[PDB]
Design a protein around this ligand. Structure first.
Ligand SMILES: c1ccc2c(Cc3ccc(OCCN4CCCC4)cc3)c(-c3ccc(OCCN4CCCC4)cc3)sc2c1
Ligand SMILES: *[C@@H]1O[C@H](CO)[C@@H](O)[C@H](O)[C@H]1NC(C)=O
Ligand code: NA
Ligand code: NA
Lengths: 12, 28, 250
């Protein structure tokens, strides 16, 4: 299906 | 790299993977 | 990967996943060549026909994975890109000639039992191994069939095909910078890359020094695992000079 939540540290 | 292409869990332990023989046997 | 099988843990330490920030999704495969360089196909980052044109701030490089969708805590490492380099002579208008790109991570990644760089070939290794009939291995989390997603990294071993054979199977004009791989309709064995696999490494293990070398990059195909059709790969050694250049200069 869809992907899992990855640590926010990586999205900024 | 110094140790490029050598896999920690296989080459470094001298263990082969499930299908690498297939590759090798193709190399006449 | 079509008609492949589940990769063993730590089988392709160099495998990488090209992850889109938003929406969070699998873009392409790639390979780790050093502690600060990732190697992928250019059409993964730029392809005007399909309105594709990503930048450093658009994606993430996830190394050390096995599972496709799970955030593999304590094992995988996610990196940010500092600079993307596409080959100045990538022919996206015609045949994807020179489908190659380099990505420089912001900060080096540390190797482990699951993260390890693959070798680039030298003339000899390419001279000796790149031969019709010689099998290579492709890996990825791409679709399992042309027309669904695997749970873990897939793997498939394919033989390299005679240049004449490749040419006669397509209308597209193929160049020296590409080579096709795959089984023939008669050989009774199948397998091929597929959407989401492109950009990945096509490697071979040297029977001389026991090392793995990336001989190609999944570039393009016409469908997935179609009889009488083959997958085309970027000839890595043929473009090695540009690789070294970019690495040394930058
Ligand atoms: C074997 C080897 C490579 C690939 C590729 C890459 C690949 C790269 C480039 C291609 O372009 C064809 C032209 N060429 C280029 C050079 C000579 C001829 C074709 C296939 C596949 C794929 C298919 C569709 C897609 O997006 C769907 C989604 N889009 C489709 C419709 C809407 C948006 C993304 C990846 S399947 C596959 C199997
Ligand atoms: C792609 O994006 C780059 C960087 O934002 C931009 O300068 C270039 O004009 C864009 N389009 C093409 C076709 O390169
Ligand atoms: Na032709
Ligand atoms: Na085929």
């Amino acid at each position: 299906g869809d992907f899992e939540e990855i640590p926010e540290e990586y999205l900024q | 790299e110094a140790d490029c292409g050598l896999r920690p869990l296989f080459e470094k332990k001298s263990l082969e993977d499930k299908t690498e023989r297939e590759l090798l046997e193709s190399y006449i | 990967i079509v008609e492949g099988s589940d990769a063993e843990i730590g089988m392709s330490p160099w495998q990488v996943m090209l992850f889109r920030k938003s929406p969070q999704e699998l873009l392409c495969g790639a390979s780790l060549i050093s502690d600060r360089w990732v190697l992928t196909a250019a059409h993964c980052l730029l392809y005007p026909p399909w309105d594709k044109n990503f930048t450093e701030n658009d994606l993430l490089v996830r190394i050390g994975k096995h599972s496709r969708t799970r955030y593999e805590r304590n094992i995988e490492k996610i990196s940010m890109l500092e600079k993307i380099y596409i080959h100045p002579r990538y022919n996206w208008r015609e045949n994807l000639d020179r489908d190659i790109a380099l990505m420089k991570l912001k900060k080096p990644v540390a190797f482990s039992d699951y993260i390890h760089p693959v070798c680039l070939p030298d003339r000899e290794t390419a001279a000796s191994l790149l031969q019709a009939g010689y099998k290579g291995r492709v890996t990825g989390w791409g679709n399992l069939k042309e027309t669904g997603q695997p749970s873990v990294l897939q793997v498939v071993n394919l033989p390299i095909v005679e240049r004449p054979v490749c040419k006669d199977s397509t209308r597209i004009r193929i160049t020296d910078n590409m080579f096709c791989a795959g089984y023939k309709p008669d050989e009774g064995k199948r397998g091929d890359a597929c959407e989401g696999d492109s950009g990945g490494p096509f490697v071979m293990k040297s029977p001389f020094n026991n090392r793995w070398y990336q001989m190609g990059i999944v570039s393009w195909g016409e469908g997935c695992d179609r009889d009488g059709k083959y997958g085309f790969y970027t000839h890595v050694f043929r473009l090695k000079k540009w690789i070294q250049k970019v690495i040394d200069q930058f």
